[PDB]
Structure 1
Amino acid sequence: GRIGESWVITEGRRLIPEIFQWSAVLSVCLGWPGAVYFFSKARKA
């Protein structure tokens, strides 16, 4: 705003830690076929 820490910084601080956990929950809500393929005998386990 006018006086205070700037809105770019005070919403980047709120949202930049949220992007990594969004990527984590999407990489484990769509990426568990990779985790089940990784242990099977098709990958010469």
Structure 2
Amino acid sequence: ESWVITEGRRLIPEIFQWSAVLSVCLGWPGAVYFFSKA
């Protein structure tokens, strides 16, 4: 009854935030190509 809803709420905005790190730490060349194709 404890680890079925308290272990969830710690982890739902975590993976919502963790993917935002890799889209800036690794996905940042997907912006400099997008901004200036010239």
Q: What is the TM-score normalised by the length of structure 1?
A: 0.71
- Structure 1 or 2, whichever has the larger Rg, is 1
Identity of aligned residues (%): 100
Higher relative contact order (CA 8 A, sep 6+): 1
Structure 2 unmatched runs, 5+: none
Unaligned runs of 5+ in 1: none
Stretches (4+) displaced over 4 A:
none
Deviations 1:4-27 (A, max 9, x none): x53111010011110010000011
What root-mean-square deviation, in Å, do the aligned CA atoms of Structure 1 and Structure 2 show?
1.6
Q: TM-score, normalised by structure 2?
A: 0.80
